[PDB]
């Protein structure tokens, strides 16, 4: 009915706000990115610090794992993305082309492509092996807050401060669908690729039927008017929605009933990022400048 997430570890080491935490697909690691220009790798089950990955010239807003857990991609204010070998920490490629801060990034399931979104209002699609920009999409009219592939890679969902969520055909880069118009600050596909979870800067999360173009669920009670906060589907136990919040809490909702089932207290600044572990009932949360830590929380369900 309800989870019982409790704090198990606090991970200190970034020296500015943490922007994004992500678990590796194989469950072994947590990657964190920060405004301190660094990526840090931590053991997912014990919080053990593994390594620092460095090379960006300005802060990082997002980090993402390849399907096989062997590569990372980071999005920076230095207008580049970087592809990293996680084992060696080496920068394999630098993706140049955006003309402003790169804010969000993701591999496709094949992990032959990276998608990125930027303050320059475009979405770019990149070749992992060569590092070349395959396609530039004039996707929005304000900064692009989030980009995500669906489970077979055939679609990209993007969101923007312009108020729009759009679905793009990966192969052709053409728009398939556009969904008050408050800024859309986060979006991602559900695991089954049937739904899209969208955050808007009016303190609201919404679950959309992609094909139907209709809103099925709305989740409220948290605070989100200012920052691009990540939101998640939690599927390892009970089916929850998880999000950070500008009141410094992690919120967990029952996906079906929309009821808040837990609020996790401990952070001392905006909880900008949360992530759900692929096999265990473990949440990672991270906060901005007044906090700068990552917390690992574990539940029985």
């Amino acid at each position: 009915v309800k989870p019982n997430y409790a704090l198990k570890f606090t991970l200190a080491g970034h020296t500015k706000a943490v922007s994004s935490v992500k678990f590796s697909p194989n469950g072994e690691w947590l990657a964190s990115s920060s405004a301190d220009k660094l990526i840090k790798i931590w053991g997912a089950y014990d919080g053990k610090f593994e390594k620092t990955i460095s090379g960006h010239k300005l802060g990082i807003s997002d980090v993402a794992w390849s399907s096989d857990s062997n590569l990372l991609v980071s999005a920076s204010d230095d207008k580049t993305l970087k592809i990293w070998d996680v084992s060696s920490g080496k920068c394999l490629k630098t993706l140049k082309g955006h003309s402003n801060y790169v804010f969000c990034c993701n591999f496709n399931p094949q992990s032959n492509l990276i998608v990125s979104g930027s303050f320059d209002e475009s979405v770019r699609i990149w070749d992992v092996k060569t590092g070349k920009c395959l396609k530039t999409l004039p996707a929005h009219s304000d900064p692009v807050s989030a980009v995500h592939f669906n489970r077979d890679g055939s679609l990209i969902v993007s969101s923007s401060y312009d108020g729009l969520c759009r679905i793009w055909d990966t192969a052709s880069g053409q728009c398939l669908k556009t969904l008050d118009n408050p800024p859309v600050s986060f979006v991602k596909f559900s695991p089954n690729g049937k739904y899209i979870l969208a955050a808007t800067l009016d303190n609201t999360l919404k679950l959309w039927d992609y094909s139907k173009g209709k809103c099925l669920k709305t989740y409220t009670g948290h605070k989100n008017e200012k920052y691009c906060i990540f939101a998640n589907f939690s599927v390892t136990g009970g089916k929850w929605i998880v999000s950070g919040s500008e009141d410094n809490l992690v919120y967990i909702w029952n996906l079906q009933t929309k009821e808040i089932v837990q609020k996790l207290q401990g952070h001392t600044d905006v909880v900008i990022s949360t992530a759900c572990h692929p096999t265990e009932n473990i949440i990672a949360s991270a906060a901005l400048e007044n906090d700068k830590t990552i917390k690992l929380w574990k539940s029985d369900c």
Binding site: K16, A17, S19, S20, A35, G59, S61, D62, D77, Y101, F103, F119, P143, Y161, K226, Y227, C228, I272, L288, E289
Partner: peptide
């Protein structure tokens, strides 16, 4: 720039 409130 995800750490900043954009206005």
């Amino acid at each position: 720039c995800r750490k900043r409130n954009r206005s």
